[PDB]
Design an enzyme around this catalytic site. Structure first.
Site, PDB file in Angstrom:
ATOM      1  CE  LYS A  72      46.362 -37.225  42.990  1.00  0.00           C
ATOM      2  NZ  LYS A  72      45.809 -38.620  42.842  1.00  0.00           N
TER       3      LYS A  72
ATOM      4  N   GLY B 289      46.249 -37.287  48.164  1.00  0.00           N
ATOM      5  CA  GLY B 289      45.521 -38.368  47.518  1.00  0.00           C
ATOM      6  C   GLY B 289      46.490 -39.447  47.052  1.00  0.00           C
ATOM      7  CD  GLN B 290      45.763 -44.076  42.986  1.00  0.00           C
ATOM      8  OE1 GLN B 290      45.540 -45.289  43.076  1.00  0.00           O
ATOM      9  NE2 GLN B 290      45.276 -43.347  42.021  1.00  0.00           N
TER      10      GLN B 290
ATOM     11  CG  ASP C 104      41.186 -49.605  44.960  1.00  0.00           C
ATOM     12  OD1 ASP C 104      40.494 -50.384  45.642  1.00  0.00           O
ATOM     13  OD2 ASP C 104      41.976 -48.783  45.460  1.00  0.00           O
TER      14      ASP C 104
ATOM     15  CB  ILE D  90      43.098 -28.752  48.562  1.00  0.00           C
ATOM     16  CG1 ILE D  90      43.309 -29.703  47.370  1.00  0.00           C
ATOM     17  CG2 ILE D  90      42.984 -27.286  48.104  1.00  0.00           C
ATOM     18  CD1 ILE D  90      42.133 -29.710  46.357  1.00  0.00           C
ATOM     19  N   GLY D  91      45.168 -31.096  50.016  1.00  0.00           N
ATOM     20  CA  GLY D  91      45.263 -32.367  50.734  1.00  0.00           C
ATOM     21  C   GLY D  91      46.107 -33.388  50.004  1.00  0.00           C
TER      22      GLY D  91
HETATM   23  C1  IAQ Z   1      40.455 -37.116  49.441  1.00  0.00           C
HETATM   24  C2  IAQ Z   1      40.038 -35.895  49.081  1.00  0.00           C
HETATM   25  C3  IAQ Z   1      40.637 -34.670  49.638  1.00  0.00           C
HETATM   26  O1  IAQ Z   1      40.488 -34.510  50.850  1.00  0.00           O
HETATM   27  N1  IAQ Z   1      41.245 -33.774  48.846  1.00  0.00           N
HETATM   28  C4  IAQ Z   1      41.575 -32.425  49.296  1.00  0.00           C
HETATM   29  C5  IAQ Z   1      41.544 -34.088  47.506  1.00  0.00           C
HETATM   30  C6  IAQ Z   1      40.905 -33.374  46.478  1.00  0.00           C
HETATM   31  C7  IAQ Z   1      41.189 -33.651  45.135  1.00  0.00           C
HETATM   32  C8  IAQ Z   1      42.106 -34.661  44.827  1.00  0.00           C
HETATM   33  C9  IAQ Z   1      42.744 -35.359  45.850  1.00  0.00           C
HETATM   34  C10 IAQ Z   1      42.474 -35.073  47.191  1.00  0.00           C
HETATM   35  F1  IAQ Z   1      43.108 -35.777  48.147  1.00  0.00           F
HETATM   36  N2  IAQ Z   1      42.407 -34.981  43.532  1.00  0.00           N
HETATM   37  C11 IAQ Z   1      41.828 -34.332  42.502  1.00  0.00           C
HETATM   38  N3  IAQ Z   1      42.069 -34.569  41.195  1.00  0.00           N
HETATM   39  C12 IAQ Z   1      42.916 -35.510  40.702  1.00  0.00           C
HETATM   40  C13 IAQ Z   1      42.504 -36.846  40.680  1.00  0.00           C
HETATM   41  C14 IAQ Z   1      43.369 -37.807  40.153  1.00  0.00           C
HETATM   42  C15 IAQ Z   1      44.620 -37.441  39.667  1.00  0.00           C
HETATM   43  C16 IAQ Z   1      45.026 -36.107  39.689  1.00  0.00           C
HETATM   44  C17 IAQ Z   1      44.161 -35.132  40.201  1.00  0.00           C
HETATM   45  C18 IAQ Z   1      44.608 -33.686  40.224  1.00  0.00           C
HETATM   46  C19 IAQ Z   1      40.845 -33.269  42.795  1.00  0.00           C
HETATM   47  C20 IAQ Z   1      40.071 -32.399  41.965  1.00  0.00           C
HETATM   48  N4  IAQ Z   1      39.366 -31.612  42.806  1.00  0.00           N
HETATM   49  C21 IAQ Z   1      39.671 -31.960  44.081  1.00  0.00           C
HETATM   50  N5  IAQ Z   1      40.562 -32.969  44.063  1.00  0.00           N
HETATM   51  C22 IAQ Z   1      41.623 -37.427  50.335  1.00  0.00           C
HETATM   52  N6  IAQ Z   1      41.478 -38.689  51.047  1.00  0.00           N
HETATM   53  C23 IAQ Z   1      41.043 -38.458  52.418  1.00  0.00           C
HETATM   54  C24 IAQ Z   1      42.742 -39.415  51.039  1.00  0.00           C
END
Ligand code: IAQ
Length: 263
Positions: A36, A17-18, A127, A14-15
């Site tokens: 993740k 993230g950190q 943050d 889906i994309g």
């Molecule tokens: C921000 C959001 C994005 O576009 N997506 C697809 C996304 C969804 C997402 C994310 C991270 C993402 F980049 N993370 C989690 N859950 C999460 C949070 C912290 C640690 C582990 C996890 C699994 C989550 C839950 N539902 C959807 N998401 C991207 N920016 C543009 C960078």
């Protein structure tokens, strides 16, 4: 809190993230989840693993719920509840012009409520920003990534003097001393309110880190977004008071913002 690899399936990416890439998937006998996959080199993994059990005990309707960690094999994975509509930052930007001021205020309240719970738990986000809030069903906003900069291995991000330090959201005692507290999260929350009411505009756009520091230190503050009422902007400015003791707690913000919303 340990999830076996056999207990997860990955359905679609889906994309990013950190710390790395995120997939929609399923968790055995449990639910649909986000997963993740932590990229090699990005995270202090052993430190995070020590904290994971206590992070899972944080549970609130406006915080992204950690469900567990898959760690049998590299790379490790974190598993959470699934949120359908991505980052709040992108969500505002892509739909700019569509949101009523009331909806914008409601997003800030969701964030405020999650931050109030963290405050009461004595957990510091460090943050907080629109870019790490996620959007779910019915435009519910949930706070994500709280505390995670404690495990980021990129010194240019974590050091106040680093080239990537998130100075735009930092209170003066953070950008000066890395003196984190719930009151420095309150400052960050004020910038996030600005982001929301500006529908995802970049704060201090085209100011360098050093320029932001100088501006803030000499009394400059972000201008009122057109969609923010004078009362909402007063609250924002309360979050950007120089002395942390003069900033409201999240508990106080939540009351003030609720009264504005519900009247
Ligand atoms: C921000 C959001 C994005 O576009 N997506 C697809 C996304 C969804 C997402 C994310 C991270 C993402 F980049 N993370 C989690 N859950 C999460 C949070 C912290 C640690 C582990 C996890 C699994 C989550 C839950 N539902 C959807 N998401 C991207 N920016 C543009 C960078």
């Amino acid at each position: 809190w340990v999830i076996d690899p056999s207990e997860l399936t990955f359905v679609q990416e889906i994309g990013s993230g950190q710390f790395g890439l995120v997939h929609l998937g399923y968790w055995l006998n449990k639910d649909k989840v986000a997963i993740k996959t932590i990229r090699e080199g990005a995270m202090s993994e052993e430190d995070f693993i020590e904290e994971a059990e206590v992070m899972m005990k944080l549970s609130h309707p406006k915080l992204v719920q950690l469900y567990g960690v898959c760690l049998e094999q590299a790379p490790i994975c974190l598993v959470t509840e699934f949120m359908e509509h991505g980052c709040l930052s992108d969500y505002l930007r892509t739909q700019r012009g569509l949101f009523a001021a009331e909806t914008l205020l409601g997003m800030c309240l969701d964030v405020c409520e999650g931050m109030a719970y963290l405050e009461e738990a004595c957990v510091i986000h460090r943050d907080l920003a629109a870019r790490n809030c996620l959007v779910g069903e019915n435009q519910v906003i949930k706070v994500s990534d709280f505390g995670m900069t404690r495990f980021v291995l990129d010194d240019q991000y974590t050091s106040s003097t680093g080239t990537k330090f998130p100075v735009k959201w930092a209170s003066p005692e953070v950008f000066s001393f890395s003196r984190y507290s719930s009151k420095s999260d309150v400052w960050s929350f004020g910038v996030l309110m600005w982001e929301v009411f500006s529908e995802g505009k970049i704060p201090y756009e085209n100011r360098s880190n050093s320029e932001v520091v100088e501006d803030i230190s000499t009394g400059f503050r972000l201008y009122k977004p057109r969609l923010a009422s004078t009362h909402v902007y007063q609250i924002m400015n309360h979050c950007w008071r120089e002395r942390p003791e003069d900033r409201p707690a999240f508990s106080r913000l939540l009351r003030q913002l609720a009264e504005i919303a519900e009247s």
